[PDB]
Design an enzyme around this catalytic site. Structure first.
Site, PDB file in Angstrom:
ATOM      1  N   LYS B  46      42.444  40.094  41.341  1.00 27.14           N
ATOM      2  CA  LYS B  46      41.130  39.624  41.729  1.00 27.14           C
ATOM      3  C   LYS B  46      40.094  40.717  41.522  1.00 27.14           C
ATOM      4  O   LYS B  46      40.316  41.867  41.859  1.00 27.14           O
ATOM      5  CB  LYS B  46      41.156  39.193  43.213  1.00 27.14           C
ATOM      6  CG  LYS B  46      39.783  39.047  43.825  1.00 27.14           C
ATOM      7  CD  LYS B  46      39.112  37.727  43.390  1.00 27.14           C
ATOM      8  CE  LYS B  46      37.641  37.674  43.764  1.00 27.14           C
ATOM      9  NZ  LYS B  46      37.043  36.382  43.224  1.00 27.14           N
ATOM     10  N   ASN B  70      32.556  27.003  42.280  1.00 25.79           N
ATOM     11  CA  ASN B  70      32.791  27.943  43.338  1.00 25.79           C
ATOM     12  C   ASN B  70      31.655  28.898  43.484  1.00 25.79           C
ATOM     13  O   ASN B  70      30.954  29.223  42.522  1.00 25.79           O
ATOM     14  CB  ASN B  70      34.076  28.736  43.083  1.00 25.79           C
ATOM     15  CG  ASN B  70      33.835  29.949  42.182  1.00 25.79           C
ATOM     16  OD1 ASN B  70      33.431  31.009  42.659  1.00 25.79           O
ATOM     17  ND2 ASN B  70      34.029  29.772  40.853  1.00 25.79           N
ATOM     18  N   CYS B 133      29.750  38.979  37.216  1.00 23.99           N
ATOM     19  CA  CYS B 133      29.844  38.639  38.619  1.00 23.99           C
ATOM     20  C   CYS B 133      28.534  38.010  39.093  1.00 23.99           C
ATOM     21  O   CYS B 133      27.450  38.552  38.836  1.00 23.99           O
ATOM     22  CB  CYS B 133      30.160  39.885  39.444  1.00 23.99           C
ATOM     23  SG  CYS B 133      30.408  39.508  41.175  1.00 23.99           S
ATOM     24  N   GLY B 219      36.730  24.834  34.446  1.00 18.60           N
ATOM     25  CA  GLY B 219      37.512  23.694  34.101  1.00 18.60           C
ATOM     26  C   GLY B 219      36.975  22.957  32.898  1.00 18.60           C
ATOM     27  O   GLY B 219      36.344  23.544  32.025  1.00 18.60           O
ATOM     28  N   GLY B 247      38.416  26.294  30.857  1.00 17.72           N
ATOM     29  CA  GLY B 247      38.785  24.931  30.536  1.00 17.72           C
ATOM     30  C   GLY B 247      40.166  24.731  29.982  1.00 17.72           C
ATOM     31  O   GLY B 247      40.451  23.700  29.361  1.00 17.72           O
TER      32      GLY B 247
HETATM   33  C1  LIG Z   1      38.031  30.419  42.752  1.00 19.04           C
HETATM   34  C2  LIG Z   1      37.607  31.229  41.555  1.00 19.04           C
HETATM   35  C3  LIG Z   1      37.541  32.603  41.684  1.00 19.04           C
HETATM   36  C4  LIG Z   1      37.147  33.368  40.589  1.00 19.04           C
HETATM   37  N1  LIG Z   1      37.085  34.745  40.721  1.00 19.04           N
HETATM   38  C5  LIG Z   1      36.739  35.509  39.644  1.00 19.04           C
HETATM   39  C6  LIG Z   1      36.722  36.891  39.749  1.00 19.04           C
HETATM   40  O1  LIG Z   1      37.055  37.467  40.790  1.00 19.04           O
HETATM   41  N2  LIG Z   1      36.360  37.624  38.661  1.00 19.04           N
HETATM   42  C7  LIG Z   1      36.031  36.988  37.481  1.00 19.04           C
HETATM   43  O2  LIG Z   1      35.718  37.644  36.511  1.00 19.04           O
HETATM   44  N3  LIG Z   1      36.029  35.624  37.383  1.00 19.04           N
HETATM   45  C8  LIG Z   1      36.395  34.880  38.445  1.00 19.04           C
HETATM   46  N4  LIG Z   1      36.416  33.506  38.312  1.00 19.04           N
HETATM   47  C9  LIG Z   1      36.045  32.871  37.007  1.00 19.04           C
HETATM   48  C10 LIG Z   1      37.344  32.630  36.264  1.00 19.04           C
HETATM   49  O3  LIG Z   1      37.959  33.890  36.093  1.00 19.04           O
HETATM   50  C11 LIG Z   1      37.023  32.008  34.928  1.00 19.04           C
HETATM   51  O4  LIG Z   1      36.150  32.907  34.246  1.00 19.04           O
HETATM   52  C12 LIG Z   1      36.306  30.651  35.098  1.00 19.04           C
HETATM   53  O5  LIG Z   1      36.768  29.969  36.254  1.00 19.04           O
HETATM   54  C13 LIG Z   1      36.533  29.785  33.846  1.00 19.04           C
HETATM   55  O6  LIG Z   1      37.922  29.522  33.746  1.00 19.04           O
HETATM   56  P1  LIG Z   1      38.555  28.070  34.094  1.00 19.04           P
HETATM   57  O7  LIG Z   1      37.787  27.000  33.392  1.00 19.04           O
HETATM   58  O8  LIG Z   1      40.010  28.176  33.663  1.00 19.04           O
HETATM   59  O9  LIG Z   1      38.399  27.890  35.594  1.00 19.04           O
HETATM   60  C14 LIG Z   1      36.816  32.743  39.372  1.00 19.04           C
HETATM   61  C15 LIG Z   1      36.851  31.371  39.252  1.00 19.04           C
HETATM   62  C16 LIG Z   1      37.268  30.612  40.338  1.00 19.04           C
HETATM   63  C17 LIG Z   1      37.303  29.119  40.195  1.00 19.04           C
HETATM   64  O1  LIG Z   2      32.424  34.723  43.671  1.00 16.90           O
HETATM   65  C1  LIG Z   2      33.414  35.121  43.027  1.00 16.90           C
HETATM   66  O2  LIG Z   2      34.379  35.720  43.491  1.00 16.90           O
HETATM   67  C2  LIG Z   2      33.404  34.876  41.572  1.00 16.90           C
HETATM   68  N1  LIG Z   2      33.434  33.627  41.070  1.00 16.90           N
HETATM   69  C3  LIG Z   2      33.402  33.433  39.721  1.00 16.90           C
HETATM   70  O3  LIG Z   2      33.415  32.158  39.261  1.00 16.90           O
HETATM   71  N2  LIG Z   2      33.303  34.473  38.839  1.00 16.90           N
HETATM   72  C4  LIG Z   2      33.276  35.761  39.259  1.00 16.90           C
HETATM   73  O4  LIG Z   2      33.188  36.802  38.402  1.00 16.90           O
HETATM   74  C5  LIG Z   2      33.323  36.033  40.696  1.00 16.90           C
HETATM   75  N3  LIG Z   2      33.268  37.350  41.208  1.00 16.90           N
HETATM   76  O5  LIG Z   2      32.616  37.602  42.220  1.00 16.90           O
HETATM   77  O6  LIG Z   2      33.864  38.246  40.622  1.00 16.90           O
END
Ligand SMILES: Cc1cc2nc3c(=O)[nH]c(=O)nc-3n(C[C@H](O)[C@H](O)[C@H](O)COP(=O)(O)O)c2cc1C
Ligand SMILES: O=C(O)c1[nH]c(=O)[nH]c(=O)c1[N+](=O)[O-]
Ligand SMILES: Cc1cc2nc3c(=O)[nH]c(=O)nc-3n(C[C@H](O)[C@H](O)[C@H](O)COP(=O)(O)O)c2cc1C
Ligand SMILES: O=C(O)c1[nH]c(=O)[nH]c(=O)c1[N+](=O)[O-]
Lengths: 307, 308
Positions: B46, B70, B133, B219, B247
């Site tokens: 994370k 989110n 972020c 997604g 996605g």
């Molecule tokens: C619950 C959640 C938490 C995430 N936390 C991070 C994070 O800590 N750092 C980050 O770079 N992206 C974070 N993301 C973004 C995902 O890493 C990813 O970039 C984004 O969800 C697109 O991928 P997906 O379509 O497979 O969900 C988070 C996404 C979700 C849904």
């Molecule tokens: O809020 C998040 O944790 C989150 N959610 C995301 O969808 N992308 C992120 O980079 C982050 N992040 O803070 O690193």
């Protein structure tokens, strides 16, 4: 329960908030007429340039399970055509008309606006200035465009915005828009720009221009559209928001209005379904309102509940 | 036909291109262990800040028919925790580890990277620096300065997690910056499509609490944007690898990521909704897709999407 989708804004009355999204089903006389004859509350002409444009090589539009992608390349019959439609042909007794303008430079917008002014005055056509044909991702270019149009165009008008994706941008864009009292509506949103659809079967992109990159519309864009509608609804309290993006159903339209939309534009769905869609959408939106015990749009417009 | 999902990059071999997206199922020890025990080719912890963060009030995530939204608020156990996991606990014998870092300032990133360096050297953990972020990556000056500052103090290759861009001017500008930094050896495209607003028609309300319901979309919503960015950067940063993120629900989606240019394929929303068993299904599905299409290796079609 007596119900009404009527919308009153810009010194006009609309039977319902629905209209086509600019560029969809609004390029030719026949399309404009079809939109006028439709159940839509309004229509907007294809974004125009001073002269006709052939647009990009085909395929340049592709319908998709979750929406569409397009890189049309701004094909349109040119400003004279849409002006003449607005000046002489459109039946304003049926519904108000918006004319979308997308000059490829400030100068072009200025010159088209200078000519549009009289037709707006005489006939009541309303300018929707396409700032997202790029321009509105450059806030300076946006300011200059609006400044120039506001300087030369003696009417209220609206702006078609690209989606933004953070509050800093919502704030920057609203700040600029709020500096222009003639901008009385904001249409959110244009496509989500430059998505890339790849067909797994063909291992290829699906549109020809720009290596397959093109604007996304449809189901893909609904939460972004809602975000933008609401963002600007909140940030530009002096202005109307027109929703555009991801409307396939009365329920989707209901979401747009909850988010703050006054008019609701329909692009991809309309492209796929044809102008008969407006009869379905009005019916559906009334149905949604009926199930929810709403009689007018005013009753829930912008009233989306936060947690 | 003998087929392989093997990926080789940054001095590592990966059994397959799949890993979690940062932030999904990778916050706690239990999660990191499960991701390590999963069929994934890798995992990323994370995104961390120097100190633990509880993140935003709930609900702050909602799964949706077409993906997720989110506004987590960067809840995480803090850098020490992920550094310790990388230094002391992670079984590198099983798979390489990425550590996502998301300092709230350049200084924070610099200070963490200073400390991460030794562990990267010693254990081979690989940094994925979160520039997206919820915004550094939408500010190109800041991005360059940040990468400069990190590059100064971090003597290893690393990757950057990028927000999506939506026009070529920005692909060009972003790519130009990233190309200034040879240490940036991979680019992960994409973080969420930022600040969408999901409204539940039934409740007439938003569905997450923070930021008036606005939050990052993941997604199905994001796949063409993800593919666009993957490919945009794949094209513009030929000296770097692209990790796809966005996605991916099926091996076919992953096939698209790879066709667009992806080396690793990260799974966020789908993983959140299915748990780490998803990786067995994804590897199996991608192999199936490749078998049908008569591909033996990812190399064979990576970045080979045909234009018209
Ligand atoms: C619950 C959640 C938490 C995430 N936390 C991070 C994070 O800590 N750092 C980050 O770079 N992206 C974070 N993301 C973004 C995902 O890493 C990813 O970039 C984004 O969800 C697109 O991928 P997906 O379509 O497979 O969900 C988070 C996404 C979700 C849904
Ligand atoms: O809020 C998040 O944790 C989150 N959610 C995301 O969808 N992308 C992120 O980079 C982050 N992040 O803070 O690193
Ligand atoms: C084929 C096509 C042509 C379009 N032409 C224009 C246009 O000329 N001017 C404009 O502002 N938007 C144009 N758009 C964007 C739509 O007006 C609308 O903003 C976008 O498609 C999102 O709506 P939707 O989800 O209902 O498709 C066009 C979209 C499509 C699919
Ligand atoms: O390519 C188009 O015509 C097009 N496609 C869109 O999706 N949005 C536009 O604004 C425009 N435009 O040029 O006005």
């Amino acid at each position: 329960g007596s119900m009404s989708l009527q919308v009153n804004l810009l010194n006009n009355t609309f039977a319902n908030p629905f209209m086509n999204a600019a560029g969809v089903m609004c390029t030719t006389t026949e399309e404009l007429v079809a939109m006028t004859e439709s159940a839509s509350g309004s229509l907007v002409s294809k974004s125009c340039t001073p002269a006709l444009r052939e647009g990009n090589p085909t395929p340049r539009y592709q319908a998709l399970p979750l929406g569409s992608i397009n890189s049309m390349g701004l094909p349109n019959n040119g400003f004279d055509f849409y002006l003449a439609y607005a000046a002489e042909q459109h039946d304003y007794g049926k519904k108000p008309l918006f004319l979308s303008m997308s000059g490829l430079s400030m100068r072009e917008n200025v010159e088209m606006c200078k000519r549009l002014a009289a037709v707006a005055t005489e006939k009541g056509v309303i300018l929707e200035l396409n700032l997202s044909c790029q321009v509105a991702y450059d806030f300076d270019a946006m300011r200059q465009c609006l400044t120039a149009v506001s300087e030369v165009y003696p009417h209220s008008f609206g702006v078609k915005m690209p989606p933004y994706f953070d509050f800093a941008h919502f704030d920057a864009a609203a700040e600029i828009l709020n500096e222009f009292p003639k901008v009385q509506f904001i249409t959110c949103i244009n496509s989500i720009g430059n998505g890339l659809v790849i067909d797994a079967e063909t291992e290829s992109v699906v549109i020809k221009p720009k290596q397959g990159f093109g604007g996304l519309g449809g189901r893909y864009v609904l939460p972004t559209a809602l975000a933008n509608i609401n963002a600007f609804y909140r940030r530009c309290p002096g202005k109307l928001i027109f929703g555009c993006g991801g409307v396939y159903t009365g329920e989707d339209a209901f979401l747009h209005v909850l988010a703050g939309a006054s008019m609701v534009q329909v692009g991809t769905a309309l492209q796929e379904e044809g102008p008969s869609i407006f009869e379905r959408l009005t019916s559906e939106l009334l149905g949604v309102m009926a199930k929810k015990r709403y009689q007018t749009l005013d009753e829930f417009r912008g009233k989306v509940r936060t947690l």
